[PDB]
Amino acid sequence: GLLAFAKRRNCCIGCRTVLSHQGAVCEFCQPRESELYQKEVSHLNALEERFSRLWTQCQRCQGSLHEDVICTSRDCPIFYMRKKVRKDLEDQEQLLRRFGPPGPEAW
Amino acid sequence: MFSEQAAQRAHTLLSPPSANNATFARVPVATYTNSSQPFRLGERSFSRQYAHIYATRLIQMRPFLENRAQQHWGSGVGVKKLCELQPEEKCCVVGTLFKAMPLQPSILSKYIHPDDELVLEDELQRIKLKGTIDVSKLVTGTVLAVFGSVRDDGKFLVEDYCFADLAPQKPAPPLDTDRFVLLVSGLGLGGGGGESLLGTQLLVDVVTGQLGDEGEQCSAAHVSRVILAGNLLSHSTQSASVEAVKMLDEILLQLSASVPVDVMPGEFDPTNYTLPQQPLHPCMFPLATAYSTLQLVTNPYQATIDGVRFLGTSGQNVSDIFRYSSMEDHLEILEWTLRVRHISPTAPDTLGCYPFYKTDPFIFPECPHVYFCGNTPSFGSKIIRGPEDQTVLLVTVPDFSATQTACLVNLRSLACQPISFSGFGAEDDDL
Amino acid sequence: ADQLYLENIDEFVTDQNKIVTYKWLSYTLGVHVNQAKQMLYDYVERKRKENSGAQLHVTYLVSGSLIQNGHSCHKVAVVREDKLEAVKSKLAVTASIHVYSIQKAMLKDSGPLFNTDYDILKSNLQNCSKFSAIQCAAAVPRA
Amino acid sequence: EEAELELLRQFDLAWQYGPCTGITRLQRWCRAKQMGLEPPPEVWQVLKTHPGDPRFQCSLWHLYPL
Numbered sequence A: 001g002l003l004a005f006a007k008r009r010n011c012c013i014g015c016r017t018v019l020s021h022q023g024a025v026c027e028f029c030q031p032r033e034s035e036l037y038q039k040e041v042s043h044l045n046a047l048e049e050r051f052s053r054l055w056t057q058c059q060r061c062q063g064s065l066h067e068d069v070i071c072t073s074r075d076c077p078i079f080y081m082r083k084k085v086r087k088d089l090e091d092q093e094q095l096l097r098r099f100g101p102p103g104p105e106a107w
Numbered sequence B: 001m002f003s004e005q006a007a008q009r010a011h012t013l014l015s016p017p018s019a020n021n022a023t024f025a026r027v028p029v030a031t032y033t034n035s036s037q038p039f040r041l042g043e044r045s046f047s048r049q050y051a052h053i054y055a056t057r058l059i060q061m062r063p064f065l066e067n068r069a070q071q072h073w074g075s076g077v078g079v080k081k082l083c084e085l086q087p088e089e090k091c092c093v094v095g096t097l098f099k100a101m102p103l104q105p106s107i108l109s110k111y112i113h114p115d116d117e118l119v120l121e122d123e124l125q126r127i128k129l130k131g132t133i134d135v136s137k138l139v140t141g142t143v144l145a146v147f148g149s150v151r152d153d154g155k156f157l158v159e160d161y162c163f164a165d166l167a168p169q170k171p172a173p174p175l176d177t178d179r180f181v182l183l184v185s186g187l188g189l190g191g192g193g194g195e196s197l198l199g200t201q202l203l204v205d206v207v208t209g210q211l212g213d214e215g216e217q218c219s220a221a222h223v224s225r226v227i228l229a230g231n232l233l234s235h236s237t238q239s240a241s242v243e244a245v246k247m248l249d250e251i252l253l254q255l256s257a258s259v260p261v262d263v264m265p266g267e268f269d270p271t272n273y274t275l276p277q278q279p280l281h282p283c284m285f286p287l288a289t290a291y292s293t294l295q296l297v298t299n300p301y302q303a304t305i306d307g308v309r310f311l312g313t314s315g316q317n318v319s320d321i322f323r324y325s326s327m328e329d330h331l332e333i334l335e336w337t338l339r340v341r342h343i344s345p346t347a348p349d350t351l352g353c354y355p356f357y358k359t360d361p362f363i364f365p366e367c368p369h370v371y372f373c374g375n376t377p378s379f380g381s382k383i384i385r386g387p388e389d390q391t392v393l394l395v396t397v398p399d400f401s402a403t404q405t406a407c408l409v410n411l412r413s414l415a416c417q418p419i420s421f422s423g424f425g426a427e428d429d430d431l
Numbered sequence C: 001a002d003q004l005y006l007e008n009i010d011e012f013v014t015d016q017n018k019i020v021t022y023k024w025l026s027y028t029l030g031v032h033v034n035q036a037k038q039m040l041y042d043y044v045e046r047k048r049k050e051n052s053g054a055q056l057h058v059t060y061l062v063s064g065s066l067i068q069n070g071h072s073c074h075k076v077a078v079v080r081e082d083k084l085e086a087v088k089s090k091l092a093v094t095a096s097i098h099v100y101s102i103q104k105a106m107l108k109d110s111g112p113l114f115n116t117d118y119d120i121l122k123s124n125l126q127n128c129s130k131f132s133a134i135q136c137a138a139a140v141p142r143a
Numbered sequence D: 001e002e003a004e005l006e007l008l009r010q011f012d013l014a015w016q017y018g019p020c021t022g023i024t025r026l027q028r029w030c031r032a033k034q035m036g037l038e039p040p041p042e043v044w045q046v047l048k049t050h051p052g053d054p055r056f057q058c059s060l061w062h063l064y065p066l
């Protein structure tokens, strides 16, 4: 009920201080930013490796490589373990867009 | 080529001091164009499934294989869908392989086993395959045409089969004065020796213009570009990485002073895991981003360097094919990858990629003049011909941490020469 | 003129007991790189013609072409004082000879010859193309 | 309506336009048109006389935790 009326306060990635503006780093903890980018891209890297091992296992348990998967088997660990990594990746991809882009894209 | 011209003058340096010493200038790079835009991913939405990729791969690769099976087996054509086959009748089928291997790990060194089946699959159904076909040279994900008949046990008997082949290739303009290009891979900053340190120092000292006589300084001034291809920080164990980016920043500063440089992410480098790897973020390089001669690019990399067009990877497709096949020669695997018209056919089944849905971007749409690979254990180079007028130079770049070898590519004669660096070690010839 | 760098090298080498590469002796005295190699050859020729029995050890550099199995490679090596002529006779074409370093008491491997160049780079970071034979034009600090 | 909701349900299961349960309906219509397989000009003419309704502009199983 109340959960819809969010404010979505941003927070510093280094020391957890809520503040106005969208930049990821805090003004006291700004120098140590290359290390804080280094940290958490090795987490995105390990979530990417878990998405792909799971969503292609359903293709081999199903039989076909060219048509959709429909298997909501409640006794398979595969089901609902393939559902949460989509959201982990959704969240961890958006935390790294706090940092700018590493280049242009319209050239 | 290079070492021929490096002796073409007089030698001044075993002499007492002089009034003047010669200087030179770096040759201009008056044409360059990056055309690796299908690998730069701006939106990056997950939450699709991997079935949109196989369907567009088949739909795009089908007319090439029909048009080659016509002129390879005769225009009295018998091409037919997998469901409309009658028992014991001669026909041609165009489909996608699937290799059914045990010993491939599931969720809960080679991996080929003496028994494993091939299955030809289309969008609606599958069929098994036996006959005259290679069981261990082929991998899951190749699209091909095949000739034979449906037998009585439901299986299929194969007589001969054909691949897609090389794409068209427009000719390049010839050059006036020879320009060179240097290729290095796998420095391994973080661990791997001390002879690698003096090797890296001697390499940057030669290319920057600090070392050797006026022969070497005249010949290293003609090197137009530098390409560093993946695996810059070799890592011993993840769970070190913070102190290595400082030294990589210093080295890229000392190279960005004189030459233009292109830097590519590799197997261990701070980027994503899926195959169109995005460029490195500039916030890890404070010093080297002062100059506009340093560039950070995608792992898959195309370019047009002085008319000659380049395409390369950091050696992740070739070792993946090496895992699940029987071929050993990395130059042969690179040429085979060229022969089936796909940079990485084992994706996604054992090599992860992004879930595209509009068009598969690993199909070759044209033919490159040069086509290199990444972190291969030894040097190799070759020239191959097409059916039409298509010639391609194939280079495998060695790994600097063991061999200490780089490659020079001439842009007018189109040849490749190795360069090797070796300081003296703890060597005493009186024991 | 000559006595300036001759006395500077004679106090750097034999008194402070240091290891002098050409890049260290070009960042100390503000000299071109080739002129620094010529300076070191001048010093070693004078003090090896004077006495013949000094406490002096040299290391050179040899570069040039080679053919191992058909293919033409280009081999570059930093070599000691005993093994020069054999390395010169293994090669096919010769392309570069100069001097790399001198020592007081003999080392065991190529260890400290990287430490010296690295440390003298470490404090001198706004100039490395300053004494370089190649001066490009588009590389000036812009971004 | 109630006849336009079966035409879209028939466009969504024809195998000659693609394996589509992850994307929108108009994206799959334009994907087939690019490759030009044979999109019909009626599954377009109901996706223009409507606004952003989730029971026209969505795949059949856009619920359903698959």
Ligand code: SF4
Pocket: A057, A058, A061, A062, A069, A071, A072, A073, A076, A077, A078, A079
């Ligand atoms: S969810 Fe589990 S049971 Fe269902 S297809 Fe995937 S692997 Fe098989």
Ligand SMILES: [Zn+2]
Pocket: A012, A013, A014, A015, A016, A017, A025, A026, A027, A028, A029
């Ligand atoms: Zn903070």
